[PDB]
């Protein structure tokens, strides 16, 4: 045979976690007290004569917001502990004659730039029956952010995972042409200088943020020498003697 | 139908379980299932499969419990295969008939029910079931010789040769065909 | 014969699922309580004196919205579990003389860029009666998003599935020149730190999102050697002896 | 008309059923239909077709039930073919006439009714029905020799030869033509 | 006029019916019409046409019913052709005259009425009608020899030869011309 079917196998697994916490409160009556956590009190200005606040409190968007009005007392709390999981699998296949380039697309085009499953390759069958592959897989998807003033408007970003390399394999052999393991951690703690270290009540004088991420990738290639289905063949389609 | 789905955390795990099952690591698959929650119908039936294949005595009860769930067809089939293992073809044929009825497209069920019938003596029904299994599978490997040996038992040598030509059977399978033809009966 | 009729067969099946859930509530009378799920409470600001809220609640667009006003109590709930199914089939055919290029279009043009069923091919019949095909099928359709400031306005995007390759077949033989299996899963859980883990009531302190997708493709080519209909032929048109 | 349509989940399934029917996998098609809901007119008539072809005894009842539904024409035709299988041409001709009336364009119905008439002796009516079937089909394969053998039974050898020239019949079909001419009568 | 129009679903069907009519598949056209609603004037007249040509006994009634509808001209013409088939030229001439009156431009009606007159003996009127038909048709095929044979019956051999030159008639048509000249009378 002089024609090659190339099977690609792509897998990505990613996990993430997120935590945050902050607290603020106000008191009234004769006296007046306020404790605004970092970035919480920016919405409000107090009048010249100190008789009371002159603004409206806001809310943190990203996390659960709890409020409590208790007459004189007024308090706000933002908290969150969340996790995410993502999984992706793609097994594109493509046939091409020896020495001939081939291309495949399974995504789309936005105002034009392509995305989605892409695959360009060029198999060469050598005199020793080994297969030399020039291969360039891609797996991309839309990510919504940013903007532009030319050639588009409010165009989204792309989350892209691609590889490009050249290898040699025998019929049926396989390679992990690419792989990745990644991990990221970011933390931050803000506290009132003295009160933040109280062993129990200190938590109410602290603000916190935590972001963690992990990821793993695999791209596997497998070339096969193939022949056309016979003229009488039924085409592939989509919707003791015991078995032991 | 089965109105139970597992999350990408504990279903990505059933994928590994299946990999172990078909790897010959039935026992490791049992270990990983034991890690997973007991009472999960999928895990329960997978465990029963492993137990029956490895010779454990609890596969019987596992199949029994799953008879009254969405995992009915495979529970009936498991109990049938147990009866076959014991040699009690009488109830084995009944349970295999029930299983093949409830989920018909299962080639494995049809090919097992045909063998059970052939052992029990319903040669016409055995031919029916073997043909169903052989048609379901893309040409068949066990089904094809399951009908070839039935033909041999029936003596239609030229019809058997017709199938040799059509299926394109090889002597490597003809030897096993005669062996299983002797086995039947 | 020196003329080739090429039959293309394209099939795509895709499935999707979607789930989400969130809850929020408010209470009044002497005391005041609020619990805003992530992104739910951004519409509202509370006054300086803490006598009451000063904004209007909104609704999540994508899912079923249930509300309950019960005097002091006020609650909102967004939930959805939905699934989708899509199927596509295309069987374009095209005739061309040996060594001559041919093209076919069956879609349209928007302000100009083409889309819809497309097919460009170039069949060569070799001295051994085998057919060498240079073929480049496409199946595309409009997808509505994004915008542009030049060469168009509010122009939509395209959902594109295309292939390009070169192969050799005998009269009547077939190839699966391209194929794909894909799967994507995305999940996220947000919870109030301590209350979210209550075995029963925790569900009301959690927000969830799930997106899953699956897909399968096939592109099949089949060349036939053909001859013209006879001069007296009736043209093809569109609207025991027993049969056994 | 038939005011019943099935979803892309259970109709994508009837496509596979049809594939099995024309693949020679009638029994596997029966299995897959059994998977699908019983009482569905389409599934009911498909099952009846399989049952009648494979020799099952329930095809009769399936056709009987479908007589009182939108699946009337094919139910009448099924009962007619059953009568033909039993050799009782008397009621077979009646039922085939009814079926050919209710859905006339069906070439299969016309070619079966013509054979039934030829067996029953209404040679002019048999010629009518055979010509209808042969005209419906794009040149005909069974219809063409169904009228050729009728001509042979009628002795118009030169008219038969006229049809040999027009249809461009081959000796490979002339042998079967004489065989079926002997069959008729 | 005919104030009845059918939709693109059941008129795309009458197109196929016409295709069958002119294909020689009159009987298949009858089948497809039977599929279409009975009582539709178009389907009624088409069915009557098929019935009359194939020899059915109901064409008479079909034409009769359509006499009292917008399908009047062709109903009169059908009854006239029936009378001609029976050989009763007396009423055939009357009905053909009525039909040719109500829809004059129909070349077929004029050429049939001329033949009916020629049979009945109104040679001058037959010449009138044959000339009308021959002028309507673009040179004529049946009309031209319908006037040539009338001339032959009238003995104007040199006028007939004038028409041979003008029409550019061929001996292949001269033979049929003399045959039909013998037929008339």
Numbering used by the authors:
A (entry chain C), C (entry chain A): 131 to 241, 256 to 383, 412 to 416
B (entry chain D), D (entry chain B), E (entry chain a): 28 to 212
Excerpt from the paper describing this PDB structure:
The bacterial Tight adherence Secretion System (TadSS) assembles surface pili that drive cell adherence, biofilm formation and bacterial predation. Here we use cryogenic electron microscopy (cryo-EM) to reveal the architecture of the RcpA secretin in complex with TadD from P. aeruginosa. In summary, our study provides a molecular mechanism for how the TadSS secretin RcpA assembles and is coupled by its pilotin TadD to the outer membrane.
